[PDB]
Give the backbone structure.
Amino acid sequence: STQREYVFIPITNSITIDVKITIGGSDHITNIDERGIHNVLVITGYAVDEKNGRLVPTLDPCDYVKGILVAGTPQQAQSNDFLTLKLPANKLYLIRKKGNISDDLKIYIPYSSPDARNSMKTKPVSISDDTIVNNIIKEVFDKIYNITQKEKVKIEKVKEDIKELFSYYALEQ
Amino acid sequence: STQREYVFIPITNSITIDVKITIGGSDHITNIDERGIHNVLVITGYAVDEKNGRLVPTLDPCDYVKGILVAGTPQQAQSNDFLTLKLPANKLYLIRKKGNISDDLKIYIPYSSPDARNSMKTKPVSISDDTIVNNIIKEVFDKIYNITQKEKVKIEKVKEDIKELFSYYALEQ
Amino acid sequence: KRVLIKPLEPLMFRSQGEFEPLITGSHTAAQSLIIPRPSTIAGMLGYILFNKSSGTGDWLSDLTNLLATIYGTFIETNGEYLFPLRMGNHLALVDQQHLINLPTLLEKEYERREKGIYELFYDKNKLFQIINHQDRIGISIDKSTRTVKEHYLYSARYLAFKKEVNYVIFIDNDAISDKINGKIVNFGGENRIAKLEVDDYKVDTSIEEEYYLALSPILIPDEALDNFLDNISDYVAMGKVDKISLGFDIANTKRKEMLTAILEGSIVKRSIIDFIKNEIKNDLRYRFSKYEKIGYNTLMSLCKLALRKILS
Amino acid sequence: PYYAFAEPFFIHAITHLHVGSGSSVEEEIALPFQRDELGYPTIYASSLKGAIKSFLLKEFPDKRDVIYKVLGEDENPEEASLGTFLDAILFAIPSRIIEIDSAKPYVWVYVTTYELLKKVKLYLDSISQLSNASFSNLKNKIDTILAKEGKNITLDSDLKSAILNEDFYVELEALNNKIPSIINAGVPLLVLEDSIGREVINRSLIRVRRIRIDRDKKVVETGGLWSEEYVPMKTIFFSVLLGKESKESAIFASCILRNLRYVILGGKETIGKGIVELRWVKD
Amino acid sequence: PYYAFAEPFFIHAITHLHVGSGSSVEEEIALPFQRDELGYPTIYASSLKGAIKSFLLKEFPDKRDVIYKVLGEDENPEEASLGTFLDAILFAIPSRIIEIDSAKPYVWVYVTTYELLKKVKLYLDSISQLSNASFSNLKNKIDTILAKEGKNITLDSDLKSAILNEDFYVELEALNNKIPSIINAGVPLLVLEDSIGREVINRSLIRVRRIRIDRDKKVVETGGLWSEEYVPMKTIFFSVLLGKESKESAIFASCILRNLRYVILGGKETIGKGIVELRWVKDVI
Amino acid sequence: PYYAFAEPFFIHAITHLHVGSGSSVEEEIALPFQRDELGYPTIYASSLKGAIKSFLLKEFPDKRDVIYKVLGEDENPEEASLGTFLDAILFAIPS
Amino acid sequence: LYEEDYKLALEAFKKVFNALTHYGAKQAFRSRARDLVEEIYNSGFIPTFFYIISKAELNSDSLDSLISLFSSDNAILRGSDENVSYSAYLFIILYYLIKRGIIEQKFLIQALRCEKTRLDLIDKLYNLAPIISAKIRTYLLAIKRLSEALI
């Protein structure tokens, strides 16, 4: 019963609380194995709210957000609006992948019905200003990943992969 | 409209009696076109019973019966022994294809239950002995393609064709 | 000020007509130009900087609304500016130092002159050290038989670059120096790729002499022809006059116009610079001004790298 | 704008490859490979585009729209294509090695030259900042390598001497101390001098003679003998997919391309001479 | 799937086979064998195909249509073939062993290296992608073998030491004493390292000086003396037969392939060199 | 029936038998005996075929055309040979 | 690369065609060529070099009219047993080894001039067996061709 949850990787700190459990299920797929963040999950056709960060649906395929798929629950007592969907696990648009997938995985997505007020202008947003990347690591890559300063030494690689791999889409609304 | 039925071509007799509907609609699938027969059907895993020529269904995919496809319906009284089937015409193993075909069909094939009391050892039979060639050319092809011997001096051509094109497997019993 | 067009791979600049299967019973073929006509470079730079509701029928009025005075094109291998030089149907890339004594070499008497032009186009020629036509035969495959079609075979003689090579054009404008620098253009035909490099490079222009080198085709007003083709030996020393098509425009999907021109590498005498001005009307001036703008009527002193337009 | 994004990839040969050019070179071969200007094997962009196009039109026989948009149309009704291939330049050919004074056993290594890495750098740097991808970790390694140009360099190992292709004795040298290898394999890589490299490489290329037999007497038919030239299994070519941005690329380069690993390149595939593998530079 | 059917098979030599080599590089032997890019022996799929084709054209004279369809027409081809052969990798060559410490003694063993399983694995993955077949047993055995790369091992028999081909001492480890033999046979399989495996293999090959005697004087003719390289009996190769669907491919794969067991590859047939057996991996696992 | 006839036979050495392998440098013995792939003696079918053919060519000076057909012509080979000798396995050695 | 080798197959030779006269141990040189080459590239350079030196003694007229082909021309290496006529191939190998700097004429000359140093010469070769076998490959195959052409 190892269901997963997606966490987008922004620079605007609308990511206050993500998962109540650091591990939950035993196995974790997005592993940093002395080459960088691997098996990262990229979800297209969507974007992220700058404020109150969530997966806002557009229809344009050129819009996408990249984030981590990790085993954990979103408090298990809230978020009826979350996209709770089970997949045959050969459809996940993984990139820089080096691990395998277990043929059936249940994913939770932070979802919010978009708007009823105006059209959405979107914008590419790269993760930059490493003073934010350090924060991101200390916020999720230290809460989930306890590996901090234990066996891995190249924290700078963990930073710089975020400096190039993650590039999401915003709405400015 | 266009629903065909399969006249197999062995050396043995009892062929021209299969249908009193000898032409049926407008044309046929097998098209003698003064250059050679075209669009010959091949039924694999079936062998002929030379006595009252009819395709006994074996299982060996090596055993096969090659014959022509013609538009008709069995003798107005059969189809209690004729196996009937409706095929998209791309699932039709044709040989010497020339054009494109109806893309949906319905075929009657002369059929005879296996008679499991008789071991179905099968012998590959061919067509030679120009006597047989001629009593085929006249007793089946003239009735379906009367244009034979009308303008075409290619009785020789279709002679070589039905001598070098049709073979079949018989129970030899 | 200067623009280097560095090809990433062999390039195809066709020069003649049909390059597609039209006759069922014959292959097609084509052959690349060694130096792209300035219409090509103009169209490339225009493609980089485009606005989608301007012109629609002019293809150069709106193009000249974007480009500066483009100056002619030539090779640069390692800081070694190679320059085209054309005799009757002969085309050679000669370095700079072999153009100084050139006007005197064609005014020498018979055997000296022929020996000189021979060693120039044959031995002091450097085309075949930098570029060799690389033929590329292709086919079209019909999925029904997984075989070549009914003579859908074409041989396109590409342009292979045996070493690091660029094309050198200079452009007056500077606001563009940043909007094209570092652009991976679709330079040339057959869907090839080149890369642009820009750096300010002072070049002297306002210079007058007796003999010039056509760095770019010198267009002719299409009425002065009878006034020109009669006395051709009085305007060009060596080279090649020909009828060329200005290209193929994208916004209208039309083959551009056809003009008699004096091809690259030809040596024109000074008596032509005024002649065209003498033999051009007031509105054909307004058209050939844009033509010179996109880079056509470019000249160069045989003594020094000093470019010069004609109607300008 | 107009090639806003780029994706390079390695074309790793799974079987031998033949990509013909007719009888296009002055050689002892009747059916040579597709040569560069430097005589090294290459895969023209036409062949690469056509092969991948034909493959995708059958491996996704519903995306005809997307593939026809990106990789262009066939019938006369057309429109500007919006994804192009660069000619596949040879990267590293395999080579049999007999190492002298090395206890790390190696029966084969990859072999490059400096001519080849020059062109690979030409491709890589022409995209690095020109487009919006981060391949510094590779362009800088190649720059490190080209810094040592003129002498036989061994990467990611220490051999100091070897016999390549059973005919060529080379004396190597470690680059600095080690460089993180640029291929997931464990095989060493040698960047030989351009003079001996084009001999080791022309020694790696397969050049077979084939025969056409008279069945009724099992003897060769007169004039029934020719010679071909395949490029060895495990060879590696390098090229880039350059794509414009028109909302089909966002689909092409995202789900069609994510699914491609193996395609068929060049001819003679009944002899099994076309299978190849595409690794995208994303590791 | 790109391919309708995909049939991997092994090629067990029944007699010493000699598929001649095409190359203008001058080598030692007058008539060498076919080498792959690693110097090992191989059967270039052109030879595989041209031999199996001419065999089937006689053994099944009533199915010249199916054969001509899947293996290409002979004289006037209006179409491409639908069947493909992949070059035959050497899988395991036999070598004479002299045991040191083992309960049961052997006199020959099967010798394979790792640079060969690393090509069989390429083929298996490449074909599981371009087909529907997912050869889980071959792959799940070969990856387990390759996990122990870098050390000579024995798959089943417990040897720990031996002298292969009477010149090479090797010290062998065991895999799990649970892996069923890749092929089904009683002789062990040694997965040697590659530097030593190369020499063991090259010792397994059979070079044969032959002569041409004058019938009159019973002395060699002036020129008739050459050398000739073979490959032993019991040698196992690996190839794959692949096909796109045409309803004559579905009949090829179901009538022709179920009745191919012995073919005559290579040349030197008049002297018994070439009879070879085909085992279809769908069977042997 | 890929083969018209198949005629397995034994080869009983009446006298001692020497079919030579050829020289070497690691030979240990000047003139050795032909060997199997696994060390036992054998007669390579080229030796067998040439011996039997040169015997027949003089013991049957009128079937010479049948011999040439089945065992391959000498002067101008226009064709393969219908005959095929398999290498001689050792069956039993006296001890 | 080894284009100079085809001239060395002559300037080393200087004669092995009638310096090896009498057509016996002369026509045995084709055997040397073919068999020795095949065995060097199947067995090894060392197992063959031992086998070759065994057929040619040290400190005798063999050595005399072997080193004589280092600074002279007329060396009739006559003798029926292939021992003066076996140093043909030995000289063939040695001339290449010295004129390609694989080993130096200093060490070689000074080595085949007293019994103490033949052991060290042979050990030196043993240390250079792969290099020698790879380089001398074409130079030897050229003589295997020159035999079946001329000799």
User: Anything to note?
Assistant: Chain E touches chain D at residues 2, 22-24, 36-39, 44-46, 49-50, 54, 57, 71-72, 74, 80-81, 83-87, 113, 115, 119, 122-123, 126, 129-130, 193-196, 198, 240, 242, 269 (CB under 8 Å). Residues 102 and 159 of chain E are 5 Å apart (CA to CA). The helical segments of chain E are 45-59, 64-70, 114-129, 136-147, 194-204, 249-256, 281-284. The longest strand of chain E covers residues 5-13.
